Design goal:
412 residues; alpha/beta; Rossmann fold; Molybdenum Cofactor Biosythetic Enzyme, Chain A; 2 domains; elongated; EC 2.7.1.217; nucleotide-binding
Amino acid sequence: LGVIADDFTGASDIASFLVENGLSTVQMNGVPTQSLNSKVDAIVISLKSRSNPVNEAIEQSLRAYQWLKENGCTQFYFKYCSTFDSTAKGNIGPVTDALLDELNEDFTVITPALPVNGRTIFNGYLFVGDVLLSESGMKNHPITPMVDANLMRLMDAQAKGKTGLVAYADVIKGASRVQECFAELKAQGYRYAVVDAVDNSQLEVLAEAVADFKLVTGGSGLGAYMAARLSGGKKGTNAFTPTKGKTVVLSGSCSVMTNKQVEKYREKAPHFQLDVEQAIHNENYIEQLYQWVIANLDSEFAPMVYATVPPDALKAIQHQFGVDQASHAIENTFAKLAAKLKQYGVTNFITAGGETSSIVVQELGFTGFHIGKQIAPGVPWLKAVEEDIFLALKSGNFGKEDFFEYAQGMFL
């Protein structure tokens, strides 16, 4: 199974869904230049093609497909947002068409639905919670505003073909009936088919119906049920975790949740607060931190180096050292420390904060990861494809208070 996602958050989202439903998954960030020496059930390629120039999105998508194809994928999934984010030139249609063309196929399904998570489709109209898409916040979206809730109309505006519908009344009759409707829509000259779902069992039916489709499109909802069918109901209970090795926590976020997670963890393990003044003027700071970390790698809980300070104290630093000057010092420090620790032999990295996580992954040079056991919603355990290194990247809002120790508790 090859998934081609139009954004990072969505790629991570569906990838977790595939794993939480029994499928071994590898999420590549961008089209890879080297083959995947690993045998997995699903490979998700994360792109930045939600609203970039349409010919770029098409070329990139075709490149992702060619790679996924070269690397064993036989079924493809074009993943987009559950709110159908696009415009009349919105790449959803162009990309679907390009993919259909390349594949020598002429029909596929459309479904940004996951009823349990407030994304329902009735009569082809998309609802976002209790209201129509056109009535939600999406109506005034900053990049891709949505003023029409009718999916067949939205797709028709940006597609080369015509969009049909498999209504609720027919989905509730089963997979076979859906296929009969698929056969009917195709005879009527439809190239795509929106499928209703006001309840999750409708995705379960569709999942079964599209079992032999060379290509399918949608949000995470369908992909999840496709994984559940392919796995036979298996869950993520047996997804991997880090094996025993040296671990380090690098916290840089100053969000309300992170500040509490740090305040709760410094109580449990060795902690060294990263001082911004020293990050910019002391040249031996990285060497000091490195020595300190490795000399505290034997405690019960991994040592933690953190920049995390209350949003109040942070704004005070931003207005004394400068927003960008202080941001760099912190990022360059974690990056150079993480590189030294990896060379030394640390195999598990637990980061906190969006920027801190990106910089550490950037420095270590990882291009993709094997998705593992879920530590918290949105925070799975990872393992680089390049080498046996595990990482837990926690954006500032995810995880409960005891996140740091918990992340470690599961593999001990």
